[PDB]
Amino acid sequence: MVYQVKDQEDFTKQLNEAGNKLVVIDFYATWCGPCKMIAPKLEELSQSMSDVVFLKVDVDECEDIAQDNQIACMPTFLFMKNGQKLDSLSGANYDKLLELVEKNK
Amino acid sequence: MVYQVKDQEDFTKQLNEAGNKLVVIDFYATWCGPCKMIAPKLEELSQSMSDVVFLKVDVDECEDIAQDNQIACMPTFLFMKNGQKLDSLSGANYDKLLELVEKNK
């Protein structure tokens, strides 16, 4: 599953529940074409990779979180582990997403 | 000064008000760092150039306008003249922006 982050507190809770697992966070908007395009692929990946945590943040609903992460070009995928940033990807390039997951899991 | 488009009807009103002038529309978000950094430059261009009209659209306030113009990155600048789309620019590249303005005005 790809869990929808509710607010800053929820984001923190989810980053903790991940323990030592890679966390992939999709910063998106409902008005974003490329975002809607790649969302099903992220969901598919999440169903198989139980050792990676997949989250999504609607930038319209969590503007404070978007500002914290210097989001600009969507979808943006942020890669974190133990609450710390490892990498970031701008745009819906699925191959680059898989490469960064392989690298950081 | 850069006028903020209020809604879809307002967007047509501003496009009509521009007459024959090039219109530069800044699609932005209040959480967008690069958007904030370039906003004063746009204000200065707006104050200085009398043959170009500058508009801005807050994607959180006008999600429908963002979707309809297939916005993905921010800021995105849309260049219109007499109701026609001439060009688009993704990101806060001021030189490219200025190039497209000189080219299309």
Numbering used by the authors:
A (entry chain B), B (entry chain A): 1 to 105
Paper lines:
Litopenaeus vannamei thioredoxin (LvTrx) is a redox protein with a molecular weight of 12 kDa, which catalyzes the reduction of the disulfide bond in different biological systems. The determination of the crystal structures of LvTrx under different redox conditions discloses a dimeric form mediated by a disulfide bond and other residues that are involved in the dimeric interface. The LvTrx contains four cysteines; two of them are engaged to form a catalytic disulfide bond (Cys32 and Cys35); Cys62 is not involved in any interactions, but in human thioredoxin (hTrx), it has been reported that Cys62 is readily S-nitrosylated, giving a SNO modification; and Cys73, which in previous studies, showed a dimeric behavior in the crystal system of hTrx and LvTrx, mediated by the interface disulfide bond through the Cys73 residue of each monomer. In an attempt to determine if the interface disulfide bond is viable to be reduced or if it is a consequence of a crystalline arrangement, we used X-rays as a tool to conduct experiments of radiation damage to monitor the reduction of the interface disulfide bond in two crystals of LvTrx.
During data collection, two crystal of LvTrx were diffracted at different transmissions, referred to below as LvTrx-1x (8% of transmission, 1.33 × 10 11 photons·s−1) and LvTrx-3x (27% of transmission, 4.14 × 1011 photons·s−1). Ten datasets were collected for each crystal, with the purpose of analyzing the sequential increase in the absorbed dose of energy. Specifically, changes were observed in the electron density corresponding to the region of the interface disulfide bond (Cys73-Cys73') and the catalytic disulfide bond (Cys32-Cys35) of each monomer. The deterioration of the electron density was dependent on the increment of the absorbed dose. In the case of the crystal LvTrx-1x, the interface disulfide bond (Cys73-Cys73') remained stable, reaching a dose of 34 MGy. However, at a dose of 3.4 MGy, this disulfide bond showed double conformations in the Sγ atoms of the residues Cys73-Cys73' without compromising the disulfide bond formation. The interface disulfide bond is shown as one of the most stable disulfide bonds to our knowledge, even with a significant solvent exposure.
